[PDB]
Amino acid sequence: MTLNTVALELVPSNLDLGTAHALAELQKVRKLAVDAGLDGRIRHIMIPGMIGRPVEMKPKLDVLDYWELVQRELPDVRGLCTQVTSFLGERSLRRRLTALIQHGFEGIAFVGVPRTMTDGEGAGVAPTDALSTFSLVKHRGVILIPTRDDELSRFGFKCKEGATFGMTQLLYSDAIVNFLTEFSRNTDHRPEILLSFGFVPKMESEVGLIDWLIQDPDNGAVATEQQFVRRLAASEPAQKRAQMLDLYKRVIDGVIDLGFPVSLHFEAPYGVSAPAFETFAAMLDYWAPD
Numbered sequence: 001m002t003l004n005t006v007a008l009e010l011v012p013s014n015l016d017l018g019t020a021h022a023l024a025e026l027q028k029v030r031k032l033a034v035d036a037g038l039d040g041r042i043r044h045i046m047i048p049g050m051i052g053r054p055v056e057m058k059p060k061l062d063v064l065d066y067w068e069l070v071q072r073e074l075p076d077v078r079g080l081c082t083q084v085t086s087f088l089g090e091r092s093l094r095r096r097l098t099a100l101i102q103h104g105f106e107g108i109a110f111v112g113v114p115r116t117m118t119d120g121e122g123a124g125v126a127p128t129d130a131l132s133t134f135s136l137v138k139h140r141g142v143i144l145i146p147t148r149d150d151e152l153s154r155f156g157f158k159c160k161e162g163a164t165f166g167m168t169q170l171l172y173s174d175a176i177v178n179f180l181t182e183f184s185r186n187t188d189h190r191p192e193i194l195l196s197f198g199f200v201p202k203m204e205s206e207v208g209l210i211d212w213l214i215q216d217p218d219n220g221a222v223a224t225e226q227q228f229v230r231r232l233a234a235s236e237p238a239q240k241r242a243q244m245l246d247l248y249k250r251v252i253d254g255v256i257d258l259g260f261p262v263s264l265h266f267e268a269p270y271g272v273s274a275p276a277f278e279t280f281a282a283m284l285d286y287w288a289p290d
């Protein structure tokens with residue numbers, strides 16, 4: 001009833017390319033994992049669903065079919081996914097969630113609305129409502145942004161409504177430690193937490209995708225994190241990873257005794273690579289779950 005896993009985010013490939021290309025790239029990802037030692041250490045693949053971005057984003061294969069392909073080249077892995085609920089009518093959301101569960105997904109993270117909208121503002125099913133209505137989904141997740149306004153009220157409402165895990169935004173500070181200490185004090189809510197850590201490549205200083213992914217205009221806690229990302233991208237490989245490891249240790253040490261099931265979520269926003277997987281592997285060598 002807990003996952004207690006390491007999850008690697010694997011984005012579906014472009015529709016342009018066809019199923020034969022996606023499979024070949026998956027065979028390459030497996031070789032990358034084995035060259036770094038990650039094969040048995042990654043229990044789940046997390047496949048994000050679709051939704052002014054410095055990288056284009058083109059039409060992708062449906063999460064359902066990319067899972068079919070992932071299963072072929074990674075025959076032991078299990079699967080999680082992300083689904084936006086706020087823009088699908090209730091009956092259509094039911095069909096979509098049923099398919100994902102039918103196709104063997106162990107857990108689904110329900111996602112709400114972007115920065116331009118307020119809570120409840122989609123014309124479809126709000127994630128808070130979805131957690132109640134589809135209580136169908138054994139492992140119902142949710143996004144957790146430790147730095148975001150009113151998140152203690154928001155995350156708690158979702159736990160009340162039935163969220164069983166929370167998947168964090170990319171963590172480039174120790175704010176999550178502050179959040180769950182307060183959260184475990186104010187509430188009896190103890191959901192499994194998927195701490196997300198993302199490899200920052202050199203080109204981030206040129207392109208700024210991770211800057212764009214984590215932005216929050218007048219926050220300052222995020223600006224602290226934004227300064228961290230720029231520091232990482234300006235760092236040569238060894239100094240960068242030790243910087244990341246220093247954060248990882250600080251986060252793991254300050255969370256693991258707080259009473260929440262702790263899982264991991266590893267992603268590479270510019271795509272998987274040996275430098276990312278070597279960085280991931282250094283992390284698990286400090287702490288990994290089971």
Ligand SMILES: NC(=O)C1=CN([C@@H]2O[C@H](COP(=O)(O)OP(=O)(O)OC[C@H]3O[C@@H](n4cnc5c(N)ncnc54)[C@H](O)[C@@H]3O)[C@@H](O)[C@H]2O)C=CC1
Nearest residue numbers: 048082110111112113114115116117118119143148169216
């Ligand atoms: N879809 C995915 O796979 C992932 C989603 N996210 C972020 O989660 C957001 C949705 O938040 P939920 O809690 O699921 O929805 P929600 O409907 O429960 O929360 C929406 C509220 O948060 C604000 N908000 C939305 N995105 C924000 C962001 N990136 N930073 C700061 N405030 C933001 C909105 O203005 C609104 O007040 C997406 O916009 C995305 O940026 C992060 C990682 C993964």
